[PDB]
């Protein structure tokens, strides 16, 4: 999309591998502000907003908290307390054309600065002189949107840059965006520290003859101790014998 009409995709109800982005060589700019980059695979957020647009090379520095420019004022404003990551990469081989690529626009004129995360797609004629400018364009009546001309022969700073702004926002609704839950190979018949779906403990994990119903995951005895469990990777039932202890 263009930056005056930037696209917004609501990433929710899924699990996000952020370290296929942070370990990607393609991205020229990867700036996480409120959050450490490597800690994204562990933190769980309620939802993510992906705001995608195309700007110039020299306007990438304005996609930042507290920065000020054309893009920050009239196209895309980030709050001062912004948590999230700004990702930008050069797209001169896609968004540039030999005969000009005038499909990408930006708002030049507005009566006031945008509030943070506000979108303004109105193309109405800008009253720049406060004459009776009754809709018709002309003198002191400007079209508010200017076009980025893009050629592939451009230098750096005039080339197109695709920007995706990930804003991880956490309302007190239940969080549904998490990282990949790492798993390791199952070891049986040994006294190991098991962590199965948040249920932790120490025990010997052996094969079990208890046939669970498919909705049930753990097993308890009379004394409310977890003695049976289901492996989440392969749906098999394991008995958790306590590790041997005894008087000497």
């Amino acid at each position, epitope marked *: 999309a263009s930056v005056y009409a930037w696209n917004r995709k609501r990433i929710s109800n899924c699990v996000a591998d952020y370290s296929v982005l942070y370990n990607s060589a393609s991205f020229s700019t990867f700036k996480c502000y409120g959050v450490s980059p490597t800690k994204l695979n562990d933190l769980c957020f309620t939802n993510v907003y992906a705001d995608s647009f195309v700007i110039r090379g020299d306007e990438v520095r304005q996609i930042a908290p507290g920065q000020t420019g054309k893009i920050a004022d009239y196209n895309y404003k980030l709050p001062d307390d912004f948590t999230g990551c700004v990702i930008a990469w050069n797209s001169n081989n896609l968004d540039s054309k030999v005969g000009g690529n005038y499909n990408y626009l930006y708002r030049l004129f507005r009566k006031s600065n945008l509030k943070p995360f506000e979108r303004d797609i109105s193309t109405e004629i800008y009253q720049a002189g*406060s004459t009776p400018c009754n809709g018709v364009e002309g003198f002191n009546c400007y079209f508010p949107l200017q076009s980025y001309g893009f050629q592939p022969t451009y230098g750096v700073g005039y080339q197109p840059y695709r920007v995706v702004v990930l804003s991880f926002e956490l309302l007190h609704a239940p969080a549904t965006v998490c990282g990949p839950k790492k798993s390791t190979n199952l070891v049986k018949n040994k006294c190991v520290n098991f962590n199965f779906n948040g249920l932790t403990g120490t025990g010997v994990l052996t094969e079990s003859n208890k046939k669970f119903l498919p909705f049930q995951q753990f097993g308890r005895d009379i004394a409310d101790t977890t003695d049976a469990v289901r492996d989440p990777q392969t749906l098999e039932i394991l008995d958790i014998t306590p590790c041997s202890f005894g008087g000497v």
Partner: antibody
Amino acid sequence: EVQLVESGGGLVQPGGSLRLSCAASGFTVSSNYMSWVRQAPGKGLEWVSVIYSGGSTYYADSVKGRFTISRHNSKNTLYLQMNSLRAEDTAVYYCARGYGDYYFDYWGQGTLVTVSS
Amino acid sequence: DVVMTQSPATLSLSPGEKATLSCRASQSVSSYLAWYQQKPGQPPKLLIYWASTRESGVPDRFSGSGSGTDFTLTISSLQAEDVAVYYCQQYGSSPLTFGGGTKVEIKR
């Protein structure tokens, strides 16, 4: 049909303050990009400052921290408050309406600021 | 900054011949250049913008060409009132810089 009439020039002491005014007639200063441009006597043009249509102000790096561009929106007036004026700030200053911070479509007649003892 | 260099420093031509004025940029501005005319005493007035397009009211003899580093303002037939200083402006980069000017005078 526009006119840009400027006022407020004269002598200041080196280190003094001076407030230049720019009245507009055929357009409104509140919703245009407005700029102050320096021209020293004998030397070419030099951009000093700009205020955006939404109110964002920018300055040249040789003049940052000393000048302040502002507007009065009620009857279309542009102000430049100048502080700590060096002896290299003697020049004719022009206020100009720009189409963005790009090209200056209409200019003011200019006001002469002389900085000497 | 972007240093903008005019050529020549002074141009003295007869009325009616081709006035070619070159302007060179320190780093490439794509089409982000304007040309202004300043008569003595008067403020500058915008002749062309976006390196080619004439501002309204400018005579047809003023025209412009060029891109990248080299730019050119051409007056096809000089008249008597074209004695002025002509400036080129870049505006692609964030510090708006002007050229040093070219003083065009007429022969007689």
